[PDB]
């Protein structure tokens with residue numbers, strides 16, 4: 454008769470392998486979104502909220518962009534994001550990244566009609 | 578030419594899979610009925626068993642042998658979809674990082690029930 458301990462392991466345990474762990478999210482994603490084809494993009498943030506909520510930021514808190522422009526906007530709320538940045542040993546075409554999941558406000562630059570995000574400026 | 582808007586979506590959007598459908602079935606949780614909800618923990622077995630030595634808390638049923646993990650653990654919640662119908666069980670998969678609460682018993686003292694994630 455299965456023990457209570459083994460029933461729990463059966464119903465609930467699925468330890469991830471190294472290839473499947475979140476720490477490898479950035480390495481897979483920077484590659485599949487084509488951000489490592491020509492050189493290693495040093496830093497890049499992925500945003501996990503809906504597209505509606507991210508597009509909505511273009512009508513939220515207007516802030517200066519790092520480059521000096523003023524078509525940047527910060528979300529009023531924090532958003533689930535994942536920050537990818539090159540590890541010290543990363544070397545093109547073998548780019549490597551440290552994955553950091555977080556909840557932060559995002560700052561995006563907006564342009565066009567409709568006025569939507571066209572550049573990711575910072576997470577704060 | 579890919580638009581400026583579409584380029585932003587490619588480099589930066591990753592909003593919100595059949596993981597629950599397969600695991601619920603591989604672990605025999607859909608054998609004669611669809612178990613309605615279940616949670617899988619992706620930490621090592623040793624780290625999960627160590628929770629029985631962490632924060633002692635009351636279980637939902639009032640027992641006093643529940644334990645909450647000091648740290649958040651990577652987990653996946655499996656919830657039956659609205660269309661799910663035995664023998665064609667179907668689940669929505671939601672990943673999270675939360676503290677887990679397990680009831681423990683036995684010698685050695687190990688988890689025997691998943692009570693909640695907080």
Ligand SMILES: OC[C@H]1O[C@H](O[C@H]2O[C@H](CO)[C@@H](O)[C@H](O)[C@H]2O)[C@H](O)[C@@H](O)[C@@H]1O
Nearest residue numbers: 614615616637638654655691692693694
């Ligand atoms: O008795 C406590 C609860 O047990 C189940 O819910 C918990 O366990 C599930 C996995 O077995 C989790 O997915 C869920 O988040 C937990 O709260 C049961 O479904 C609940 O009705 C009980 O209250």
